[PDB]
């Protein structure tokens, strides 16, 4: 199918997310992210990883 399936606008495939705030214990660390999904985008969380 031509239209109504894949966009013709400037849209990325993979995004890179810098940690917003990282904190460390002696046995663990914590990484807070902003998982920003823009307009008209769906994100299956199976495609997300660290």
């Amino acid at each position: 199918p031509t239209h109504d399936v894949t966009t013709d606008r400037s849209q990325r495939l993979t995004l890179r997310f810098i940690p917003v705030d990282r904190e460390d214990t002696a046995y663990s660390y914590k990484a807070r992210f902003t998982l920003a999904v823009g307009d008209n985008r769906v994100l299956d969380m199976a495609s997300t990883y660290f």
Partner: peptide, 28 residues
Amino acid sequence: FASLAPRHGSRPFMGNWQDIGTSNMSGG
């Protein structure tokens, strides 16, 4: 929603109706 489906010939290649949800568990 035949404009989203690929065209095998001139018919839309649709899935089945009842194949929408999952039902698998640890033995059930």
